[model samples]
Target chain A: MQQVRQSPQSLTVWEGETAILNCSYENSAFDYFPWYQQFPGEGPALLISILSVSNKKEDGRFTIFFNKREKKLSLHIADSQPGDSATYFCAASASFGDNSKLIWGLGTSLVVNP
Target chain B: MQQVRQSPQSLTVWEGETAILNCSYENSAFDYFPWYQQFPGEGPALLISILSVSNKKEDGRFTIFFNKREKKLSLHIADSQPGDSATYFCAASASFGDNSKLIWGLGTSLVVNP
Candidate 1:
């Protein structure tokens, strides 16, 4: 079993700045990592993900940087907006399927101030 | 597009009663279904899951009732406790090229009164 640890329990950033959230894992056996963004009263939404084999993944203003050797990862939210003020969670899974479960992190609360 | 609908956005039940959360899907491109529990300031964690091939899956006081034919399912929390107070999410998943795409419901908030 693997556990994920996220750093900077909370972060405050100015609008238009980039918000970087960090996470590391133990056991390092997972093949997939996903970043989910959750707003209050709503379920978390899959924001971005990266395969362990890949070093980086980018989608729009969100990017996931992966370090398989160190078993570390970070999410960069470019051009942060006030609406992006919510909780960001990092998760790892050994495989991608219905049977494979995801190990979640405590989550980082990001506040983008205007 | 897959839409997973969870009913009774909020539910309140007594300690020893059964709490039922319902979910209905529009169509089935989904073969896998999962339920997650989330508390404030943290991410949602996998609670119980079921496949299209099965109709029921139970773990501890939590049970998932699936009806693939009806494109519906429900989560039954027996002997609900105050600790079970949190939001529940039902997700529809389909295997992508190298990952699984998860479509989530709005979420059901449950409060177990002592």
Candidate 2:
């Protein structure tokens, strides 16, 4: 079983700036980490992800910084905009043994100001 | 890449009856399946999960019946109540490469009657 730890229940970011969200986990076997972004009335969308063997992944202005040794990861959104505001979740999985449940973060509500 | 297919975008069930929601996937490597329930203004919670090796997992009135041969699974809520109304999601994850992502179902909105 794996456990994911997240902090900062909510965050507020301004337009054109940057927002950084953090996460920590208890399991070292978790080799995969993915960030999900969800807006109202919609399912979660894959924002970015990082492999345990890799430290970073970038897509557009979204980047995931992952450290396997520390079991920590962060999502950084650059040039943030009001539309970038949404609920963010961090999910991880090690092996799909018997009960391959994804340990999820509590989620952080981000509100971008114009 | 794995794809999860869900049916009936939405459903309405009478109280005390049964409500069934379905999901099918494209990948055979997907050995784990989980159902998520999300209410308004809250994050999705894990209702139940089943492994490909098993056919059923029961918790209270919530049951998950999986058919690996058919590549399908369903969530059954028996004796449905109004409190059971929410959006349900079926998600799948295959591997943890640099871009491993969880392909999610469009979601099925379940409205239980009183």
Candidate 3:
């Protein structure tokens, strides 16, 4: 539905540098945002998530900054490593009954040049 | 936490043939199951989904048969076409408020040969 959009369809960053991936959504009803990392031939893995109430969430070297009013969020991969090279996806879902279907972005492919 | 399992890592079928993909999960708490399709350079797109309450869910040429007692499920793509060539993922979630985190299975890569 193109509800969720991600920028920089592909990105290249040097090792130990910061790689930022941006995402935006159109529906204000979407409250939960989850960032997923996927390697070739594998399923998407949940990297980190943030609720609407929180503006910032950090886990290890990955951090998510949320701007509710703008309906924008960004994932920052700090101290990027070669292994961090993968496709990152931003997904949004409205927290409701059993219908928590996620709307996904196209994705951001990140390559870390070591 | 990687509880979902899918078989036939890769498959090839004729254009008009039916393709079957199997999936199993260990967690009984998983009430929601979603299947996603992904092509190169694109994110996962929701194909079809079924809840624990239903044993069978069908949408056009796609059908999902769920066996709760056996903790298994299978997706059947009828009269598959070349455009159906993509990686299919099976995901499970418990359905919670702001915590409906989806656990994914290694995808089944399908190639419909014309």
Candidate 4:
């Protein structure tokens, strides 16, 4: 069975603080990882993504630290703001011929308090 | 810009009726389309998917009808049930190296009433 495990199902952080959400996958063949940010009533939007070749990826205040050997990765939200309060999902995918299917983590809800 | 658009922002259907959710994409490069189901406070789960080569794919009561020429696809749920009530998202992705980067639609809120 394919599974991606996410930690701290729920997290609370003060504004300006850093919040970390963790994820681990059971499949070693999964080479692509993407993090999605979703708000209530809206579809998940891609926030950041990383390939197996990279150890870390950063965009604005979001960063993904990846450890391929450990089969683990974490998304760090620096300078958390109230607007950053939302559910985050870590997803993994591996190539299968011409198409790749994604397997998702349960998700981590983050609340940034003002 | 890549965009996946889902029709009927919200839909209500009686139990036992077939529910059809429609999706269209702007990028022709996208060859993989997947429909996902998400319940309250949980992650999106892959329901069904269809590749560009196939016009239709089915699993149990769920089926995907694809129209590559029209750049559109529709998911049909036969014998709908209340348990099927949830937000359905249609996503598209293109092959990139060993990855498929997904672009999601806003989502269609499905309410199955008994």
> Recovered native contacts in candidate 3, as a fraction?
0.00
Give DockQ for candidates 1 onward, in order.
0.01, 0.01, 0.01, 0.01
For model 3, the superposed segments whose C-alpha errors exceed 4 Å read B1-114
Q: lDDT, candidate 1, residue A46?
A: 90
Among all windows of 10 consecutive residues in model 2 chain A, the one with the lowest summed lDDT is: A5-14
Taking the tens digit of each residue's C-alpha lDDT, what string does model 3 give over A1-114?
589988645566668867778899998899999999999999899989999999999899999999999999999999889999899999999973568899999898888867
Worst 10 residues of 1 chain B by lDDT: B8-17
Write the residue-wise lDDT of candidate 4 on A19-80 in tens digits: 77888898888899989999988988999998989999989989999999999999999999
Candidate 4 lDDT (Cα, 0 to 1): 0.84
* DockQ value of candidate 4: 0.01
TM-score of each: 0.49, 0.47, 0.50, 0.49
Pairs with backbone N, CA or C atoms under 3 Å apart (clashes), candidate 1: none
Between candidates 2 and 3, the one scoring higher on TM-score is 3
Q: All models: lDDT?
A: 0.83, 0.78, 0.86, 0.84
**Candidate 4 collision pairs:** none
lDDT by residue (A1-42, candidate 2, tens digit) is 437765444555457757767788998878778889999888
What is the C-alpha lDDT profile of model 3 across B17-79, one tens digit per residue?
677778889999999999999997799999999999998998999999999999999999999
Best by lDDT: 3
Candidate 2 residue A16 Cα shift, in angstroms, is 0.8
